[PDB]
Each structure stands twice: as C-alpha cells, then as structure tokens.
Amino acid sequence: GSNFCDSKCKLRCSKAGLADRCLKFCGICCEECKCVPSGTYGNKHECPCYRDKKNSKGKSKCP
C-alpha cells in the first residue's frame, strides 16, 4: 500500500462491531493526528493527539 492511515486503521478496526464507523473515525483521527494506536483497543497513550480528540459533546472521538 501507500497510505499509513488506511493501513493502520484497517488493523485498528479489524475486530470492531461497527467496522465502517470505526474506519471512518479512525481515518478522520489519523488525518488530524498522523498516528494510530496499535492493537484493536486501548494503547492510546501511543498517540496523545488520537487519545485526546473530542467531539462536540466532549466525548472521545477516536476508536
């Protein structure tokens, strides 16, 4: 491949219950942060921008 957001997000979302939503938001977050945490959940201290990103209701945005 040739886009690390697409590749990392496919891994990050590979065990998600709502895969299309996970891929959308992981993609948005990687476009903003240029970092995706490893594994399929947790590990967000690898990517402080990804970890801390919020939506308009103050809720965590990035899977």
What is the resolution of the experimental data for this entry, in Å?
A: 1.6
Contact partners, residue 14, CB within 8 Å, separation at least 6: 40
- Distance between CA atoms of residues 51 and 2, nearest Å: 24
Sign of CA pseudo-dihedral 32, 33, 39, 43: negative
Contact partners, residue 23, CB within 8 Å, separation at least 6: 9, 10, 13
Residue range of the domain that includes 12: 1-63
Task: Count up the domains in the chain and report the number.
Answer: 1
25 touches 62 (CB < 8 A): yes
**Determination technique for this entry:** X-ray
